[PDB]
Design a protein around this ligand. Structure first.
Ligand code: HEM
Ligand SMILES: CSc1ccc(C(=O)O)cc1
Length: 393
């Protein structure tokens, strides 16, 4: 049978320390039922990977939040890529894959690297930073909106709106109702910024629009894809970088290894993505009755995937609670898995790689310099404040 648990994965206590409850979720069985929200849940690597790699049984077109779009009206027009299934998902997926492709990385790498190095040097002209306010947020705010091709102003909308989106994937708790209620202004700005005239060419958004004459996407779809990049392209990377700095502070041996060989920077970042999993959870909806882990789930049921749990499953990872910058990270689900696997993962890995490389070449020590404060969000895991003293190299 399926065990029934009262754990609330969208409660502040859970956000404050999810790992005990995540173990309870893994050990209760391959498939659990969360009575708090009447949803099924999967927290082991095996089942998370199985669900992710069966997107037509466990579909996304009925929403990847708790809300089932077949039963409730979406708070915003459904995402044409995240909240779509094959075949509708194809050509937007391919378009964003070409926009955020290797070649585009070739076009943005030097700028991103210069911005990273420059921020690290600016903060060595500081010493005692809040690694969130001064580094994790500042850098992606200083590079990503430009890479999107957004006008200089209104970029401030980006952090709110993104956050809003991620709070909206959660249940109707006070975080979600907090986010959605009267968020109109952001919704306005974003809507206006997704239009071709307001996006500087050569940026990601203008390239999306540019692809509208190829027959993969139509002109009415481009603004929603620009919206997608503007919603998923900032806060996740912020929390990811904050996670990387956090780990390097908590595992000084790993910082020393990284300094010794800056070429591990990329894998360092990847390990942080596994270790903290900035995107903690995502939902699917069953399109039919389906058997998973010896249990049977009815049609039209929400299934909650615990990505961070899958990334700390001792059934899959040796020493899962240890940050190891030489760990082989292939197979982790911090970026998802399958047809929906993060189409912008090269951008995230670029930002994190160049930031951790800057730290590696320019910083000798990172020692937490105050109270660590967590940032609470229905979907995202990250830090509100990470006070550290940076000792230069
Ligand atoms: C550390 C940084 C990041 C993390 C942890 C992350 C995480 C994820 C995950 C787990 C998914 C799978 C969603 C699902 O299966 O339902 C996803 C999809 C997606 N991500 Fe990211 N992401 C990051 C950075 C970015 C960036 C920088 C961009 C864009 C510039 C981006 C844009 C997207 C988009 C558009 C999708 C939807 C892809 C699809 O549905 O086919 N993400 N991301
Ligand atoms: C994985 S977080 C995320 C991804 C995509 C979208 C979107 O397509 O709007 C929103 C959030």
């Amino acid at each position: 049978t399926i065990p029934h648990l009262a754990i609330d994965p969208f409660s502040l206590d859970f956000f404050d320390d999810p790992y005990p409850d995540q173990q309870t979720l893994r050990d209760a069985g391959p498939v659990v039922y969360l009575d708090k929200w009447n949803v099924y849940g999967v927290a082991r690597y095996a089942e998370v990977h199985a669900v992710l790699n069966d997107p037509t049984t466990f579909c996304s077109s009925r929403g990847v939040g708790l809300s089932d779009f077949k039963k409730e009206k979406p708070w915003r027009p459904p995402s044409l890529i995240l909240e779509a299934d094959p075949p509708a998902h194809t050509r937007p997926r391919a378009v964003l894959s070409k926009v955020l492709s290797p070649a585009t990385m070739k076009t943005i790498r030097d700028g991103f690297a210069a911005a990273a190095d420059a921020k690290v040097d600016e903060l060595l002209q500081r010493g005692c930073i809040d690694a969130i306010a001064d580094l994790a947020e500042a850098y992606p705010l200083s590079v990503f909106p430009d890479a999107m091709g957004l006008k200089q102003e209104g970029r401030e909308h980006l952090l709110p709106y993104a956050g809003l989106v991620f709070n909206a994937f959660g249940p109707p708790n006070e975080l979600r109702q907090t986010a959605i209620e009267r968020s109109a202004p952001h919704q306005a700005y974003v809507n206006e910024q997704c239009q071709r005239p307001n996006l500087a060419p050569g940026g990601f958004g203008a390239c999306i629009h540019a692809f509208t004459d190829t027959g993969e996407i139509t002109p009415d779809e481009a603004p929603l894809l620009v919206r997608s990049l503007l919603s998923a392209g900032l806060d996740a990377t912020v929390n990811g970088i904050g996670a990387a700095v956090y780990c390097l502070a908590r595992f000084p041996g790993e910082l020393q290894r990284l300094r010794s060989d800056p070429t591990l920077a990329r894998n360092a970042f990847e390990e942080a993505v596994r270790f903290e999993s900035p995107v903690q959870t995502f939902f699917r909806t069953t399109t039919r009755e389906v058997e998973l882990g010896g249990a049977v789930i009815g049609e039209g049921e929400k299934v909650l995937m615990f990505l961070g749990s899958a990334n700390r499953d001792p059934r899959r990872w040796s020493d899962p609670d240890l940050y190891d910058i030489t760990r082989k990270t292939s197979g982790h689900v911090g970026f998802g898995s399958g047809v929906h696997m993060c189409v912008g993962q090269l951008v995230a890995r670029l930002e994190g790689e160049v930031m951790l490389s800057a730290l590696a070449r320019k910083v000798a020590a990172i020692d937490i310099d105050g109270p660590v404060k967590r940032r609470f969000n229905n979907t995202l895991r990250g830090l509100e404040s990470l006070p550290v003293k940076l000792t230069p190299a």
